[PDB]
Design an enzyme around this catalytic site. Structure first.
Site: not given
Length: 108
Positions: A71, A100
């Site tokens: 990520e 998120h």
């Protein structure tokens, strides 16, 4: 500084690495980043967090033997981190999340 969804997504698929404005959380911590103070821009101006392994425990991203997900933060400039992340596999599938890591959609 390349830190847009499209910009980073293209850079990753081509060069197979994040642009040099990225550092892992580990690296950031060693430089004095305190997540609770939101001070990353003070101690590493121009940098964004990215490159850490994403565990995909909720198995929302497509799995595959040998496949690793990482990520990186997107659209970060200063202060506390935002909710935007690029998710990229070792076989250069690119997904994005703006919430998120709750929902993901493919962008490459």
């Amino acid at each position: 500084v390349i830190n847009t969804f499209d910009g980073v997504a293209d850079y990753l698929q081509t060069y197979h690495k994040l642009p040099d404005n990225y550092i892992t959380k580990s690296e950031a911590q060693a430089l004095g980043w305190v997540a609770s103070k939101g001070n990353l821009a003070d101690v590493a101006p121009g940098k964004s967090i990215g490159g850490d392994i994403f565990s995909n425990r909720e198995g929302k991203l497509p799995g595959k033997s040998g496949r690793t997900w990482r990520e990186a933060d997107i659209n970060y400039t200063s202060g506390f981190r935002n909710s935007d992340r690029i998710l990229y596999s070792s076989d250069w599938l690119i997904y994005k999340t703006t919430d998120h890591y709750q929902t993901f959609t493919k962008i490459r």
